[PDB]
Design a protein around this ligand. Structure first.
Ligand SMILES: [Cu+2]
Ligand SMILES: [Cu+2]
Lengths: 150, 150
C-alpha cells in the first residue's frame, strides 16, 4: 500500500487515503474489474477521540456516503466515482477500483457525508437522554495529492 | 438493560440479546414510536476470536441482515420484523422497538444473514489472494427465552 497525503481530522473522525493494487471483490459485477483498473483506492475513516456519534476512538465508521473526485493535474482530466463499503483481511474500508490517466501528479478529493436521515435512512440514531448521541457530522471534504508512478 | 438468554458463538461471531426501555430514535418513522412500544430489543453482535471474514475480535459486525420472530409462549402469539442498525452512546447495534403481549414467557428467535444478503446497503468482500477473506458465514439462527415482568 502507498499512503496518500496526510490523515485529516474532520467531522470528529480521522480520514486517511491509501491506494494499492486493484483488488477482486464479491459481488464481482459491482466494481470495476481488477484487469481493467490501475489501483484500488481506499478511504480509511475511523472515529477520533470524543466522537459525538457514539463511536469509540479507532472504530470504523459505517454507513457513510463517500464519493471521490480525482484530477490528473498534468492535463486537467477529472474523473468522479463512489466508494463502496467492503471488508478485507485488515478490516472494513470504503474502496473503489480505479483506472487512472498515466503517471503524473493527482489531486484526490474525498466527499464524506453522514448516513441518510430521511425517509431513505439505513442507519439510526438514539436520541433519548440516557443513550442518545449528538447529531450527524456536517458533510466534509478531504483533499490529498500524490504522484502516481505506474 | 436486561440480558435475555445466553450469548452464542455462531458464524464466527458472538451474538447476545438484551432489552431495555423503548428508545426514541431519529429519523422519526424508521421504527415503531417509543410511546407505542413496551421494550427496545437489541442484538449485540461482535466478531469472535479468529473471525474468518476480516473483523478483529470484539469489533461490531456491520451491514448484517438481522430479522426476528418473537413468540409469546403463553398463548402462541407471534410477531415478526427486522432489527435495524443504529448507534447509541455506547456504540452501534441492531434493534427494534416492539409492543409486547403482556407478562409471561417469550422466545426471541434471531435470523442473522451476512452482508452479501443486505438489500438495503450493498457491502463487498475482498476475494483476491493478497487481501481477501474467507466466504461469508451461512445464515445462522439463535434463540433467547425470557420472562417479561410487564
Ligand atoms: Cu478495499
Ligand atoms: Cu437500540
Amino acid at each position: 500500500e502507498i499512503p496518500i497525503g496526510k490523515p485529516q481530522l474532520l467531522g470528529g473522525m480521522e480520514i486517511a487515503a491509501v491506494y494499492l493494487q486493484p483488488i477482486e471483490m464479491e459481488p464481482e459485477g459491482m466494481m470495476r474489474p481488477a484487469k481493467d483498473s490501475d489501483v484500488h483506492l481506499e478511504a480509511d475513516i475511523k472515529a477520533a477521540k470524543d466522537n459525538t456519534n457514539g463511536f469509540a476512538e479507532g472504530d470504523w465508521v459505517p454507513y457513510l456516503v463517500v464519493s471521490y473526485e480525482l484530477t490528473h493535474l498534468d492535463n486537467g482530466k477529472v474523473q468522479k466515482g463512489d466508494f463502496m463499503p467492503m471488508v478485507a483481511n485488515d478490516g472494513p474500508h470504503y474502496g473503489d477500483n480505479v483506472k487512472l490517466d498515466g503517471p503524473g501528479k493527482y489531486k484526490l478529493k474525498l466527499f464524506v457525508s453522514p448516513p441518510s436521515a430521511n425517509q431513505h435512512a439505513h442507519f439510526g440514531r438514539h436520541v433519548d437522554k440516557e443513550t442518545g448521541v449528538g447529531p450527524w457530522f456536517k458533510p466534509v471534504t478531504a483533499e490529498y495529492e500524490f504522484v502516481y508512478a505506474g
